[PDB]
Amino acid sequence: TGPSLPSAFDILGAAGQDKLLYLKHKLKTPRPGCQGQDLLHAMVLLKLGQETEARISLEALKMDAVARLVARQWAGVDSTEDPEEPPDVSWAVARLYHLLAEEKLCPASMRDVAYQEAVRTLSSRDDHRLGELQDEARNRCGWD
Secondary structure (H helix, E strand, O other): OOOOHHHHHHHHOOOOHHHHHHHHHOOOOOOOOOOHHHHHHHHHHHHHOOOOHHHHHHHOEEEEEEEHHHHOOOOOOOOOOOOOOOOOOOHHHHHHEEEHHHHOOOOOOHHHHHHHOOOHEEEEEEEEOOHHHHHHHHHHHHOO
């Protein structure tokens, strides 16, 4: 078990094609307070089999390391640069799970677990964005 990139893809898989179409149509235009929407839009397209469009969306996201990892390992886009080491995905995953729980595609407890793991991850390396994340976690999870 556990909140993860592959599990988020499974949650999408399990939502039905109608719901994916709903997410594709909805996620495509931005909202305030919804970091991750763009990456989730691309994953939605990938789960619908729409790889050509998914790859165009991920290319617009290429400055983001997690979007790059998704392009390569789930969209099949080969890197054009020197090897980079895989990124920490925990924050991205928290953000994704937040959207998934808001769409009621998974329980809110799964979002909570994801924010925690992210918080643990950033702590373990004393990341200077830790406070930022903790603020976000508190706000999206409804509690400390």
